[PDB]
Design an enzyme around this catalytic site. Sequence first.
Site, PDB file in Angstrom:
ATOM      1  N   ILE A  52       0.857  -1.179   0.000  1.00 25.80           N
ATOM      2  CA  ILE A  52       0.000   0.000   0.000  1.00 25.80           C
ATOM      3  C   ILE A  52       0.896   1.232   0.000  1.00 25.80           C
ATOM      4  O   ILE A  52       1.176   1.819   1.043  1.00 25.80           O
ATOM      5  CB  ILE A  52      -0.920   0.009   1.242  1.00 25.80           C
ATOM      6  CG1 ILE A  52      -1.735  -1.286   1.286  1.00 25.80           C
ATOM      7  CG2 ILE A  52      -1.843   1.221   1.205  1.00 25.80           C
ATOM      8  CD1 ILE A  52      -2.616  -1.502   0.066  1.00 25.80           C
ATOM      9  N   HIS A  53       1.345   1.614  -1.187  1.00 24.06           N
ATOM     10  CA  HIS A  53       2.248   2.748  -1.336  1.00 24.06           C
ATOM     11  C   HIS A  53       2.032   3.457  -2.667  1.00 24.06           C
ATOM     12  O   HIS A  53       1.249   3.008  -3.509  1.00 24.06           O
ATOM     13  CB  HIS A  53       3.708   2.261  -1.287  1.00 24.06           C
ATOM     14  CG  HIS A  53       4.149   1.754   0.054  1.00 24.06           C
ATOM     15  ND1 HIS A  53       4.401   2.590   1.124  1.00 24.06           N
ATOM     16  CD2 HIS A  53       4.398   0.497   0.493  1.00 24.06           C
ATOM     17  CE1 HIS A  53       4.785   1.869   2.163  1.00 24.06           C
ATOM     18  NE2 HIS A  53       4.792   0.596   1.807  1.00 24.06           N
TER      19      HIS A  53
END
Lengths: 273, 273, 87, 87
Positions: free
Chosen positions: D13-14
Amino acid sequence: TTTVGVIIPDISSIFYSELARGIEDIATMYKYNIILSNSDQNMEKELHLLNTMLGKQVDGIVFMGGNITDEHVAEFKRSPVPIVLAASVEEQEETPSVAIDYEQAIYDAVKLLVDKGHTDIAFVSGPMAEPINRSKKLQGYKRALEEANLPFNEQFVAEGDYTYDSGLEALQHLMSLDKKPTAILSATDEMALGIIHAAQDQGLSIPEDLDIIGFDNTRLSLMVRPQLSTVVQPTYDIGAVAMRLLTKLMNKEPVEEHIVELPHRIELRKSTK
Amino acid sequence: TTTVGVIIPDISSIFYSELARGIEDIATMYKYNIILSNSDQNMEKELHLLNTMLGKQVDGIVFMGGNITDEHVAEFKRSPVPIVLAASVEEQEETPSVAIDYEQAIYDAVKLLVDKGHTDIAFVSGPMAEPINRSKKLQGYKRALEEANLPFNEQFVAEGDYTYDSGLEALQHLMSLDKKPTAILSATDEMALGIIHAAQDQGLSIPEDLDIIGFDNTRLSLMVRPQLSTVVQPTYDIGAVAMRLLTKLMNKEPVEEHIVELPHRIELRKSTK
Amino acid sequence: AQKTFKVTADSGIHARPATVLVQTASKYDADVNLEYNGKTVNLKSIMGVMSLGIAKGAEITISASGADENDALNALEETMKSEGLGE
Amino acid sequence: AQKTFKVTADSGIHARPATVLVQTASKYDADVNLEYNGKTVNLKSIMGVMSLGIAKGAEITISASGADENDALNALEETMKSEGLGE
């Protein structure tokens, strides 16, 4: 006050970040500020940013995109400020733009490979939905073969997306044919990197088993083993010349030809015999 | 009106173009325009652009540089608008900044190599004139060795300049020692690429003959064979979080800690046994 | 004022180094030209210079007629090696 | 409203995908949270979300209490696969 907007698909791109630097330097030289916006190649985004840039009262705009439609063209013409295209293809050729002759460059690369004995030559392009691929680079490929009296076979054309992975898959795709090519020309250096490594992952030796030529000559060309033979595109220069041409338009000075084509050439390294 | 300036050493950089994209996205999200300027790491240029940005009445600035002196610090504090540092090191730690803990990351990487049996471990840094190299990354290297009860020997530290070539030479330099290292940690992925290829140009096999770990985890990590094991730096996130933190400052909302350190980790691939 | 060089830089006369040289020539009133392959362009013109597409190994000639012509050629000669373009 | 996923994307999650998800959560009045490793953050907060440093293989939980909570979780579920982050 003295500011120009710059619409670009993706600033983190190795190619577009170089074009952008060229634009900024000449912009700094001529005292122009730069409002930078990313579009991701989304048409609605591009047209929207175009009107948004105007809202900021910019004096001109440099546009970069892979799909210039008649709608973009009209919007560029009706814009109250000057607009210049960089490293982009506009079939209608009405909007001032700076680039190289992609058709010729590909043609030259293919001719070279032919003069060396290749009969089964492959082309790994970018999305065919982009005119630069389907209308320019693919045409130079077609012309070279036809001129060497060779048939144009779709099987020798793989469609990549500029991504390193697409090049990896592009190669595995082409080597799956009953009759594999003996040479591969990639529309890009990053895809050419994937091709080389995928070829090596399958046990092939470059240039031994396969001649590979990239396109652009970005630093990536040197960061591979064997080092990539590539078509040279003066990327930084395109950005510089684009912004410079724009400043001439914004200062109403004499413009000798609005459609500029910087010279190209081929740098042969170790990915070709 | 709603515009923030962004001072960056070089937008064409693989690292800085990614940070820049993160900044722009959050800037777009929050309706802020972006004035981008390159400094090339020239101090006079940086301080000048700082005052120049103010002349354009910007609401805030994101600064990126490899050498933040007490002079920069004072200039940042006296600036009438908020300033946030991204991917930069400021020893005094007074100016709000967003980055990762470079000291820890290097330490972790070295500890890992030690836990694997390495005694002669080398570090290829960026210019030692930059605090991030001499005061942070080199310190994490020193601490790891000292903690494993190993001596700190300068011979196992090569100075690169982030360039792919410096990595090539860095390797050839280290392999010229009477006692060569058995593992090499590079402060950067691009230098790590040069190290791997130079090692292979001399007939060595990676990871066989030498363990190599890069730093950043840029796409370059995947575009090498063997694929590079690297310390992960959420580069895009740093840009995003930096711009986001700046918007909080510009809108006077509550700020829980001005010095932010995003988490890091290590991605092990094939350049390490 | 005048002098011929042979480009050494692998990237020839392009990019940043090309911009620098052009910005150097612009710091003078004298007409500064750049002759290459029989084509002459204003060394103060980004479009003219980069349009020549000067590759490594080529031979160019830098002219300069005017008051500061001597200073011009002197500064340019410095930029040529300062920027490692040719000698 | 609530649902747990397991991040599939290699980059976790970036980056852009993380921004997209946050921008999705922001299109609603309901409080949208993101629970991970016992730490809960505002899914509408770029700083909170990216500060968690969610890697591939992790398990997160998306909450949402308010009027449009149901629509929220529905849009987020779409973004999770739309952005190929997890399932």
